[PDB]
Amino acid sequence: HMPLLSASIVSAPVVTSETYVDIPGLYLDVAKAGIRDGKLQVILNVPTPYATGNNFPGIYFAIATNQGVVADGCFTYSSKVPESTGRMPFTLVATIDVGSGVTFVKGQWKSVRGSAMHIDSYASLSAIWGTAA
Amino acid sequence: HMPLLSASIVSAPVVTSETYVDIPGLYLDVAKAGIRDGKLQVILNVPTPYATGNNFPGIYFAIATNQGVVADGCFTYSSKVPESTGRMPFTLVATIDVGSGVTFVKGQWKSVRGSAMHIDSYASLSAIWGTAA
Amino acid sequence: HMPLLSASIVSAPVVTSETYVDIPGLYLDVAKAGIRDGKLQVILNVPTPYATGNNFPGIYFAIATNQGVVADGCFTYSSKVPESTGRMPFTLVATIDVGSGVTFVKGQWKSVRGSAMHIDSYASLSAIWGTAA
Ligand SMILES: C[C@@H]1O[C@H](C#Cc2ccc(C(C)(C)CN)cc2)[C@@H](O)[C@H](O)[C@@H]1O
Ligand SMILES: C[C@@H]1O[C@H](C#Cc2ccc(C(C)(C)CN)cc2)[C@@H](O)[C@H](O)[C@@H]1O
Ligand SMILES: C[C@@H]1O[C@H](C#Cc2ccc(C(C)(C)CN)cc2)[C@@H](O)[C@H](O)[C@@H]1O
Structure with missing residues (x-):
């Protein structure tokens, strides 16, 4: 299979959330690509986010x-x-074993101290597939 | 071919620009490497930039x-x-179809609100080549 | 071999250092994996660091x-x-020739202007192995 996976967006809704919620569009369907084992290096790249709020605002990303x-x-x-509220580039990198029961990968976000979370431009979720065989 | 491409610099000129202009040295020649199709995961990594100016300074990167x-x-x-003006790490990740007419990839920058743009240390443009065949 | 390498941590000691010192746990043993040549794209991903100090605090990462x-x-x-002291995401990307005498890759840090350096959550050192053969 193509070992490079990618999903990108040019915006998201403005979200306030105490719990992790899906960033619409930042979703890789691993199972649909026939990838049932090996490892995925996953990069969540949100280069231009901002947060608005009253108490040291920010965004948790997962x-x-x-x-x-x-x-x-x-x-x-x-x-x-x-x-x-200036633009605060954010990148997160993790490697995941697909043989552990993984069918999809997604980007999530949650408010810091009741912030409104903003993505109004390019953001991406990327993965490179590696196997030992 | 080697599936990893890379270009790095230890500095750039100090630039003020209303339009995207090339960051000298952050350039991958894809055509020269014989890569005429598939996908490239491209990372533009500017870990230590700053911008100086009078009106909420910053840098656009592409x-x-x-x-x-x-x-x-x-x-x-x-x-x-x-x-x-503190150092503001910046990373941008995109995946590109090479079969769509791509011969090179480069990093560009443009001023936010007439900022002078500064790279005075390590920065990189990286790519990993993936094919479905 | 698996072409994806990864090491991650959920915290580090609080360090003040005028010289680069190892971030414990952010270490890839390349030689142990049998990788004796080719190239490694290496990403050091410290998404949530902070620095405390009296004089424009910060952290150097290597x-x-x-x-x-x-x-x-x-x-x-x-x-x-x-x-x-807000959380300041940081990513660094470099490509390394393994045939040049490389046996390991690690993440290091050093104080800016006598800062205490803080990692108290997820951070990672990742590598993708590429060969021309
Ligand atoms: C909330 C404010 O948002 C403003 C913006 C923007 C903006 C974002 C993205 C773009 C792309 C080129 C990437 C997309 N077209 C262009 C302008 C900032 O200038 C202020 O400092 C501040 O954060
Ligand atoms: C404009 C000012 O620039 C100063 C710097 C620097 C500097 C950059 C890079 C390095 C490397 C080790 C990466 C390269 N040698 C070392 C010092 C900052 O300390 C101030 O906060 C502020 O932004
Ligand atoms: C020093 C202060 O540290 C506080 C924090 C935090 C914190 C870090 C990581 C997490 C994860 C979910 C990623 C890990 N559990 C959760 C809370 C900030 O809110 C302040 O602005 C400020 O920088």
Whole structure:
């Protein structure tokens, strides 16, 4: 199979969430590609996000499979209410064993301290497929 | 062919530009490597840039081919005139079909709100070649 | 061999250092995997670091082999003493010739202006192995 997988978006809804929720469009269907084992290096690339809020805003991002979150991180501003919420590039890299029950990979996000989360431009979820055989 | 491509620099000129312009040295010649089809996962990695200016400075970065920009994003500061313009790591990831007429990939940049753009250390443009055959 | 290598951590010690020192756990043993030539695309992904200090704090990060640093960069805050030291995602990408004497790859860090360096969540060092043969 093509060993490179990719999904990209030019925007997402403006979301406020206390729990991880799917970023629509950042989804790789691994099972649909016939990939049932080996490893995937997965990159979640959100180069131009921002967060608005009243209390040191930010966004948690995760890579999740059907089995749940495999990796996560966040950016946060260094002011309680920034003068202007600047664009804070974010990248997350994880390697996943597909033989462990993985059928899909997706990007998720969750609010820091009740922030509104913003993706209004290019963002991507990428994967490279490696096998030992 | 080697499926890993890479170009790196330790500096660029200080540029002010209203339009995307080439970051000298961040250029992959795909055609020269004999790669005429398949997909390239391309990473533009500018880990230590800064921007100076008078109006919430920042830099737009793009991945471009001979056919134009395929992906772009930016970082911006959260103050009109930051006390000190800190280093703002930036990464951009895109996957490109080479069979669509691609002969080269390059990194580009453009000013946010008339910023001077600064790369004065390591930066890289990387690609991994994948084929379905 | 599996062409994907990966090491990840959920925390590191709090370190103050004027010199590059190893981030424990971010280490790929290339020689142990039987990889004695070709190229490695290496990604150091520290999505959620922060630095505390008195003088525009930050962290230098490097990719190093047994032969020393191959690439480095940093993030820094734009205030002398930030109100709150926010999370500053950081990614570094380098491609390395393994035939040049490389047996391991590791992530390193060093203080900016006497900062305490913080990793208290997921971080990763990843590599994809490419050969021309
Ligand atoms: C919330 C504010 O958003 C503004 C923007 C933007 C913007 C994002 C993306 C683009 C692409 C070229 C990547 C897509 N067309 C272009 C403009 C910032 O300038 C401010 O600092 C601040 O964060
Ligand atoms: C504009 C100012 O630039 C200063 C720098 C730097 C600097 C960059 C790169 C390096 C490498 C090790 C990566 C290359 N040698 C070392 C020092 C910052 O400390 C300030 O916060 C601020 O942004
Ligand atoms: C120093 C302060 O650290 C705080 C944090 C955090 C935190 C980091 C990681 C997580 C994961 C979900 C990724 C891991 N569980 C969750 C909370 C920030 O909110 C402040 O802005 C500020 O930087």
